[PDB]
Ligand SMILES: CN(c1ccccc1)c1ccc2c(c1)CCC[C@H]2CNc1cnccc1C(=O)O
Ligand code: NI
């Protein structure tokens with residue numbers, strides 16, 4: 114993938130069943146270079162029979178997304194509103210006040226998002242704990258992907274909501290997610306259960322540092338008081354700004370029934386087209402371990418997610434454990450490289 118453009122894959126039912134193995138495969142195809150890949154599941158697979166019995170699902174902490182700024186540079190402040198059900202949410206989303214404007218191509222809707230994101234602030238039903246997968250679905254179950262990320266819970270005994278457990282997100286037109294990589298520069302998996310699309314921007318990991326330098330240059334204050342301020346998930350930057358400042362990036366639109374995968378150190382941002390629900394969690398591979406050792410963490414809030422790397426270094430890099438404990442392991446990540454489990458392909 115030497116254009117490092119976002120790739121789309123259409124696995125057969127038989128490639129689909131082994132999760133970590135399909136991640137290994139898409140990386141043998143270079144999919145990680147772009148930091149984001151789409152995986153369209155085989156036509157007959159479905160995580161759940163239907164979605165008409167969730168109207169009474171509670172969204173404990175929904176957020177109103179106030180955005181402030183100009184000239185394609187913005188800050189998103191996420192204001193916690195009272196508890197509300199899926200029904201109350203859908204009805205707000207589908208109301209004349211919040212529903213999707215007229216468009217006849219993505220590009221038009223993109224211009225409206227960037228022209229209108231600081232007006233009429235939407236509500237996003239984000240960070241809801243739960244899965245919408247039926248108890249019995251065994252393929253790509255966000256609730257139990259069975260990757261090595263599982264050592265945190267199984268060996269360290271630590272539960273981190275949204276990271277090693279699943280989150281649901283109820284979107285409405287113009288709800289957004291700011292530029293970030295995942296906690297600890299993990300992978301993530303994102304499945305759009307139903308509703309209108311979700312659009313994504315990605316920066317290849319091999320160019321992530323340029324995006325940090327851009328953002329640092331634009332938010333010098335933010336940058337002095339924290340080493341990884343983008344991890345606050347409050348910074349929006351338009352594709353025109355990226356283009357203007359020579360930041361390589363791609364876009365893709367995710368439709369209902371499709372997975373998106375983000376890769377370690379893959380910066381992304383994006384917005385929902387209308388009423389929808391996505392499910393997400395983080396996951397790892399062998400390659401991730403080094404990103405975990407090297408990830409640059411929020412130096413400013415007492416609350417942020419940090420995973421102790423010891424369990425992974427003892428198990429998988431036993432030979433380097435003391436070097437590492439001794440600040441002396443200094444491997445350099447080559448972002449172009451597939452995870453070792455890719456060797457078979
Ligand atoms: C600001 N913030 C905060 C973090 C720590 C402590 C206090 C606040 C925070 C944290 C998380 C989020 C938001 C805001 C804004 C809405 C969305 C989610 C991110 N959503 C995605 C991420 N990657 C990919 C896709 C999506 C998506 O929406 O589909
Ligand atoms: Ni993310």
Ligand SMILES: [Zn+2]
Pocket residue numbers: 338339340341342345411412413414
């Ligand atoms: Zn911080």
